[PDB]
C-alpha cells in the first residue's frame, strides 16, 4: 500500500482557497 | 628513504613523475551522474 509524501503531483497541503465572491 | 639520501650527496620538491589520477568517492546524489542512488526516491512514497 503506497501512500503519498506531500511531495507529489497534486497531493499538496496548501489547499486552493477560494475567493468570496466565488 | 629517498629523503634519506638527498642529505648526503647534498652535504657534499614535487615528483613530477608521478601523475595522479582522480577517483572521486561517489557523492549520495539521485540525479547527477556519478553519484551513488541512496536516500530519497524520485517517486514520493
Redesign the interface.
Given at each position: 500500500k503506497?501512500?503519498?509524501?506531500?511531495?507529489?503531483l497534486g497531493?499538496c497541503n496548501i489547499k486552493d482557497f477560494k475567493p468570496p465572491y466565488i | 628513504r629517498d629523503t634519506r639520501r638527498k642529505r648526503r650527496q647534498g652535504r657534499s620538491l614535487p615528483d613530477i613523475a608521478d601523475i595522479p589520477r582522480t577517483f572521486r568517492t561517489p557523492v549520495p546524489s539521485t540525479l547527477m551522474p556519478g553519484g551513488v542512488d541512496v536516500g530519497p526516491s524520485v517517486e514520493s512514497y
Open positions: 503506497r501512500v503519498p509524501n506531500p511531495n507529489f497531493n | -
